Amino acid sequence: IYLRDLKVEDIPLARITLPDFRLPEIAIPEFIIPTLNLNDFQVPDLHI
């Protein structure tokens, strides 16, 4: 005839267990610069 018991939460029906806390993995792309050459096409003949 009064307030009900509060231990019902101990019953599995009331449990809310779930996974969480995702994390990412690391993978960084590479950076590249070409092996450029231009002396092949011309070479100065003057003297400085």
Which has the closest alpha carbon to 17: 25, 6, 9? 9
Q: Are 13 and 7 in contact (CB under 8 A)?
A: no
Q: What is the dihedral of CA 22, 26, 28, 29, to 10 degrees?
A: -70
Measured in degrees and rounded to the nearest 5, phi and psi for residue 12 equal: -60, -25
Overall resolution, Å: 9.0
- The helices-and-strands tally (H runs, E runs) of the chain is 0, 0
Distance between CA atoms of residues 13 and 11, nearest Å? 5
Helix intervals (H) in the chain: none
**Which method, experimentally, gave rise to this model?**
cryo-EM
